[PDB]
């Protein structure tokens, strides 16, 4: 089982990007935007007693996997997928895509590493929509017994991620 430092505090990442244009000429699979957000740890730590204790990088939107698989999940916008993970500086220490669960090592004091939370916005179908990604919690990174106090969450606030399909612009030739 795992114990948390006194005053353990989740770090929340505000997922936000400038308006993402997606065009008919973009291929399915296009990384329309990879956006990074600094993870600034706050000193929270935890320590566990068993190799059966785990950390989980979980997705929370409960949207179906997109037709592209590879951890690209559908969103509320047609033809637009979202994929989440973490990195350190210079794209090192790739976490692997959310979701995953791994066992921890007993006795090790864990802290959140300085680095980056990553949002990828992906074209998942030929026909793409426009509009505002649905707000709310998108991920939590937590140890067993403490899903209610994650190390790290990521959340969309309000209209922070918008998609513009250029076909919808009705360009006057």
Numbering used by the authors: 1 to 173
According to the publication:
Further, their respective tip-adhesive proteins, the adhesins Abp1D and Abp2D, make use of large, distally oriented binding pockets to adhere to glycoproteins like fibrinogen, a wound-healing protein important in CAUTI pathogenesis. We demonstrate that Abp1D and Abp2D RBDs are structurally similar, and each binds fibrinogen and other relevant host glycoproteins important in CAUTI and other infections. These proteins share a common binding mechanism, using a large, distally oriented, and flexible pocket that recognizes a complex glycan receptor.
The C-terminal helix results from the six histidine tag added to this construct for purification. However, the 310 helix between β strands 8 and 9 forms the anterior loop of a large, open depression (>200 Å3) located at the distal end of the RBD relative to the linker to the pilin domain (and by extension, pilus rod). The carboxylic acid residues of the citrate are coordinated by the side chains of the amino acids R86, Y100, R102, and Y141. Y100 and R102 sit on the left-hand ridge of the binding site, while the base is composed of the Y141 side chain, which emanates from a β sheet on the opposite side of the receptor-binding domain core (β strand 13) and R86, situated on β strand 8. The R102 and Y141A mutations reduced binding relative to Abp2DRBD WT by approximately ~70% and ~90%, respectively. Subsequent analysis showed that equilibrium populations of Abp2DRBD skewed toward a larger pocket opening distance, indicating that the anterior binding pocket loop in Abp2DRBD is flexible but predominantly favors a more open conformation.
